Amino acid sequence: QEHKVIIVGLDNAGKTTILYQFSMNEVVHTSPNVEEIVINNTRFLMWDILRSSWNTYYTNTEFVIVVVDSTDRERISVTREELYKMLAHEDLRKAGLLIFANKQDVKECMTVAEISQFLKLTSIKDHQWHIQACCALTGEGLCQGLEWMMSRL
Amino acid sequence: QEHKVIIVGLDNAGKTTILYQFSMNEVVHTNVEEIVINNTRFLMWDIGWNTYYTNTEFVIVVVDSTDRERISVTREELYKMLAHEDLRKAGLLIFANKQDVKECMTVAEISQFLKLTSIKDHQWHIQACCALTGEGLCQGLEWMMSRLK
Amino acid sequence: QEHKVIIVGLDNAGKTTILYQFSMNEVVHTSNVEEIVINNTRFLMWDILRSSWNTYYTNTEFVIVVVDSTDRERISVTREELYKMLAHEDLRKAGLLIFANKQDVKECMTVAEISQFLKLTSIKDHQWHIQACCALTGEGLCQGLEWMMSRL
Amino acid sequence: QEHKVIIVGLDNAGKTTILYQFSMNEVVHTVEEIVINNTRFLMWDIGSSWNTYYTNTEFVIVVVDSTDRERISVTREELYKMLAHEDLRKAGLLIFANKQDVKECMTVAEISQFLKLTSIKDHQWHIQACCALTGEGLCQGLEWMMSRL
Ligand SMILES: Nc1nc2c(ncn2[C@@H]2O[C@H](COP(=O)(O)OP(=O)(O)O)[C@@H](O)[C@H]2O)c(=O)[nH]1
Ligand SMILES: Nc1nc2c(ncn2[C@@H]2O[C@H](COP(=O)(O)OP(=O)(O)O)[C@@H](O)[C@H]2O)c(=O)[nH]1
Ligand SMILES: Nc1nc2c(ncn2[C@@H]2O[C@H](COP(=O)(O)OP(=O)(O)O)[C@@H](O)[C@H]2O)c(=O)[nH]1
Numbered sequence: 001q002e003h004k005v006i007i008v009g010l011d012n013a014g015k016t017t018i019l020y021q022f023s024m025n026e027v028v029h030t031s032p033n034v035e036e037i038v039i040n041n042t043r044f045l046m047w048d049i050l051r052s053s054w055n056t057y058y059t060n061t062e063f064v065i066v067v068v069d070s071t072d073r074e075r076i077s078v079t080r081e082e083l084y085k086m087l088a089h090e091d092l093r094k095a096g097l098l099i100f101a102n103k104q105d106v107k108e109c110m111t112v113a114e115i116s117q118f119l120k121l122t123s124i125k126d127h128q129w130h131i132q133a134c135c136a137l138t139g140e141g142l143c144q145g146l147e148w149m150m151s152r153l
Numbered sequence: 154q155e156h157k158v159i160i161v162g163l164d165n166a167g168k169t170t171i172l173y174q175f176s177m178n179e180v181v182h183t184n185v186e187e188i189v190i191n192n193t194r195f196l197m198w199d200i201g202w203n204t205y206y207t208n209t210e211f212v213i214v215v216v217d218s219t220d221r222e223r224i225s226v227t228r229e230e231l232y233k234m235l236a237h238e239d240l241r242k243a244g245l246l247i248f249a250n251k252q253d254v255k256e257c258m259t260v261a262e263i264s265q266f267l268k269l270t271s272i273k274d275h276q277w278h279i280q281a282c283c284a285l286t287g288e289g290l291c292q293g294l295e296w297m298m299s300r301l302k
Numbered sequence: 303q304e305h306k307v308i309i310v311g312l313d314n315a316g317k318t319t320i321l322y323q324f325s326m327n328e329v330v331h332t333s334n335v336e337e338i339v340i341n342n343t344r345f346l347m348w349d350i351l352r353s354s355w356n357t358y359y360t361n362t363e364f365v366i367v368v369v370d371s372t373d374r375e376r377i378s379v380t381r382e383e384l385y386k387m388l389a390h391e392d393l394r395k396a397g398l399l400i401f402a403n404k405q406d407v408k409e410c411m412t413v414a415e416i417s418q419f420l421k422l423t424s425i426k427d428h429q430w431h432i433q434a435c436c437a438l439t440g441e442g443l444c445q446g447l448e449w450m451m452s453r454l
Numbered sequence: 455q456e457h458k459v460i461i462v463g464l465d466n467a468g469k470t471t472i473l474y475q476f477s478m479n480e481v482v483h484t485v486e487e488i489v490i491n492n493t494r495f496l497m498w499d500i501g502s503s504w505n506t507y508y509t510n511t512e513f514v515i516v517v518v519d520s521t522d523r524e525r526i527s528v529t530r531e532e533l534y535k536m537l538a539h540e541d542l543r544k545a546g547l548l549i550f551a552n553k554q555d556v557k558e559c560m561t562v563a564e565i566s567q568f569l570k571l572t573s574i575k576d577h578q579w580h581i582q583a584c585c586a587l588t589g590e591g592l593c594q595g596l597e598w599m600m601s602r603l
């Protein structure tokens with residue numbers, strides 16, 4: 001079984017770097033923007049996100065990973081708008097939500113608690129969710145996010 | 154077999170948020186909530202002729218680490234509660250909540266003020282946490298697991 | 303089989319509080335001379351005139367040295383006692399665990415500063431580990447106990 | 455089966471101290487052989503005629519002095535020169551950002567960015583903050599190596 005995971009977030013958030021770092025992660029099996037990521041016996045198929053009749057992103061999707069640039073205080077309102085537009089889709093009713101508060105290495109960034117509060121994460125009533133501080137330049141924090149998704153299978 | 158836990162603290166401490174976050178925690182299987190960890194079932198009561206204290210195995214005390222004015226109030230209630238006959242064998246887990254807030258009391262400051270290292274008749278653990286993110290909550294739950302009979 | 307551990311350090315370092323907190327630690331089974339059980343392993347821990355003998359080093363498997371991180375005035379005394387102790391042939395096979403205690407207090411010596419002052423990386427004939435800790439919360443104590451377990 | 459490992463870096467980086475501390479590490483059983491669980495590593499702290507990277511080098515550990523802003527460019531050049539060697543094509547790369555205890559040192563993220571680590575295409579790599587005076591961070595570096603066998 002392949003478990004479908006999509007990676008969303010605004011440009012420059014760290015989506016490419018995060019998916020790349022997943023392959024280097026200690027809990028992820030070694031392997032030589034659509035990557036199969038294997039943890040123990042579990043296979044995830046991860047997608048880093050006109051003539052098509054269909055938007056295919058949300059279909060059969062088990063986890064959405066939202067990447068947030070923690071340094072960007074102005075665009076966070078845009079991330080929030082997109083988060084809630086996305087959560088309004090019936091396709092995602094069963095999906096777990098993992099939020100990466102990325103670029104936590106940068107001084108004066110928003111704290112993970114400030115991000116949780118602004119995004120009103122504790123008001124979410126119909127989805128499992130987890131917010132995780134991370135730095136995609138080092139992979140710090142990514143293992144914890146992946147292990148949370150594993151616990152939600 | 155259900156293991157009874159009561160969650161107590163002053164208003165605005167974080168009780169509702171902590172119990173909600175338990176449901177989202179990595180160690181937990183997906184006012185009164187069943188929380189399952191591995192094969193262990195906890196029945197957790199958020200407090201706020203009957204007594205909620207009956208058959209309690211764990212007391213979780215939530216402390217707002219920013220509330221310097223009312224930590225004296227929490228201390229008095231803590232020790233008043235520890236003297237109840239229903240609670241004499243109970244494990245005590247103290248969450249020093251709102252640790253994300255700048256200039257809050259530190260967990261060591263809270264331990265020292267509450268005189269926790271002077272407790273003689275109860276297993277206890279104090280744990281820094283932030284209920285907005287669930288950080289610290291896993292460690293608190295894991296400590297309770299290790300105190301199961 | 304009891305594994306003998308001694309807890310040493312200057313007055314006010316935190317020896318009493320640490321031994322107390324061992325009883326509350328997640329890795330320790332719920333239960334100044336105390337039996338501490340971790341999984342199946344039993345440690346007999348002693349927190350240290352008319353006696354003919356120094357009995358503290360006899361058959362001692364681990365020495366826990368508790369250092370007050372805030373105490374810059376007496377760190378040289380800790381160092382002297384550490385090396386006098388380590389010169390004892392009785393302790394030739396003992397593992398050394400150093401708790402850099404009171405890490406919660408602002409402007410305390412860092413664990414690296416303590417290690418450098420104590421010249422710990424110059425130790426040639428003993429297994430050793432230094433661990434930051436706060437005895438008021440038990441933070442750091444688990445890591446210290448796990449290191450001893452790994453040295454059995 | 456011995457898994458061969460070389461430890462490299464400029465003078466004063468912390469190579470001697472790190473290899474020393476591996477033998478004191480919790481995950482390690484009590485030029486050196488380091489055993490983790492059932493796995494034997496043979497580790498050479500590099501620093502001659504007819505000498506080169508010993509055959510079947512499985513891991514390269516690069517030690518970076520985090521305080522050394524002047525010479526991090528020197529280290530970057532040596533790193534990529536090493537990564538160009540055909541006989542190191544299958545090698546895992548573990549970078550220890552050492553001396554993280556020293557105030558105002560480069561952060562691990564600054565080091566990763568300067569070394570352009572996330573642009574590496576042909577190797578498994580991990581960067582790990584550490585302090586060789588205490589051993590902090592060494593365990594995680596060793597564990598990453600174990601996961602790459
Ligand atoms: N300082 C810092 N930079 C990062 C981090 N994650 C990614 N970046 C950088 O931010 C830029 C955008 O990253 P990228 O992964 O391409 O973002 P994407 O547009 O969401 O796919 C690149 O220069 C990355 O190196 C981080 O955690 N900290
Ligand atoms: N900044 C911060 N706010 C928190 C934390 N935990 C809870 N809160 C907020 O504090 C307020 C009271 O929390 P709540 O769970 O309702 O407290 P209760 O009265 O004890 O049940 C709410 O607005 C929460 O979102 C925390 O760790 N940090
Ligand atoms: N702030 C702080 N105080 C501590 C810590 N550990 C112990 N203490 C306090 O230090 C004092 C001496 O501790 P004690 O355990 O009696 O030291 P002993 O003389 O070595 O046995 C007591 O007031 C303890 O509560 C700590 O980690 N931080």
Ligand SMILES: Nc1nc2c(ncn2[C@@H]2O[C@H](COP(=O)(O)OP(=O)(O)O)[C@@H](O)[C@H]2O)c(=O)[nH]1
Binds near residue numbers: 463466556586
């Ligand atoms: N402050 C600090 N000093 C360190 C650290 N690691 C090593 N050193 C010291 O730096 C010096 C050089 O270390 P060494 O292991 O001999 O480096 P080598 O030349 O690469 O083998 C010695 O004095 C060590 O004690 C560290 O993490 N922090």
